[PDB]
Design a protein around this ligand. Structure first.
Ligand SMILES: COc1ccc(CC[C@H]2OC(=O)[C@@H]3CCCCN3C(=O)[C@@H](C3CCCCC3)NC(=O)C(C)(C)N(C)C(=O)COc3cccc2c3)cc1OC
Length: 127
C-alpha cells in the first residue's frame, strides 16, 4: 500500500535528514510558487495511523481545513510538508512520531509513538 511505497520511495523533506517526514507527489500542482511562512493555507486531507485499515472519516470532506503555515498551529510534519507543496498539488506524507504526537500521543485516536500517513490537497494560500 501507499505507506510502504512512501517509506520505500518517498523524498526526505526534513532539515535533520532523519526520514521523519517522507513525501510522494500524487498530483503535480500549478507553477512553482509554494506557500510561505505566515500564509493562510487551505487544504483537503485524509489522515490515518500508518498501520490503519482505512483513512479517518471524522472531519467534513466538503469544508477546507485552514491554518497559518509555519506558526505551530499543526503537527511539525504539516508545517514542513505543506510548505513544499504547489497550489493544486496532492501529496502523500509518512510521518515518524517525533514530527506528530510523539510519546504523549493524543488518546484515544492517537496512541503513544504513532507513525501517521496523510493525503493532502493544497487548494489555495494567501499572504
Ligand atoms: C504544534 O503542535 C501541534 C499543534 C496542534 C495540534 C492539534 C492537532 C492538530 O492535528 C494535526 O495537526 C493533524 C494535521 C492537520 C489535520 C488534522 N491532524 C490530525 O492529526 C488528524 C488525525 C490524523 C491521524 C488519524 C486520526 C486523525 N486529526 C483530525 O483529522 C481530527 C478531525 C481527528 N481532529 C481532532 C482535528 O483535525 C482537530 O482539528 C485540528 C485543527 C488544527 C490542528 C490540529 C487539529 C497538535 C500539535 O502537536 C502534537
Amino acid at each position: 500500500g501507499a505507506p510502504a511505497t512512501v517509506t520505500e520511495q518517498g523524498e526526505d523533506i526534513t532539515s535533520k535528514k532523519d526520514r521523519g517526514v517522507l513525501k510522494i507527489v500524487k498530483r503535480v500542482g500549478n507553477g512553482e510558487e509554494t506557500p510561505m511562512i505566515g500564509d493562510k493555507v487551505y487544504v483537503h486531507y485524509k489522515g490515518k495511523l500508518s498501520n490503519g485499515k482505512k483513512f479517518d472519516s471524522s472531519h467534513d470532506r466538503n469544508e477546507p481545513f485552514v491554518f497559518s503555515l509555519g506558526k505551530g498551529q499543526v503537527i511539525k510534519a504539516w508545517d514542513i510538508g505543506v510548505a513544499t507543496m504547489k497550489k493544486g498539488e496532492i501529496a502523500h506524507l509518512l510521518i515518524k512520531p517525533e514530527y506528530a504526537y510523539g510519546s504523549a500521543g493524543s488518546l484515544p485516536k492517537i496512541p503513544s509513538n504513532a507513525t501517521l500517513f496523510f493525503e493532502i490537497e493544497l487548494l489555495d494560500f494567501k499572504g
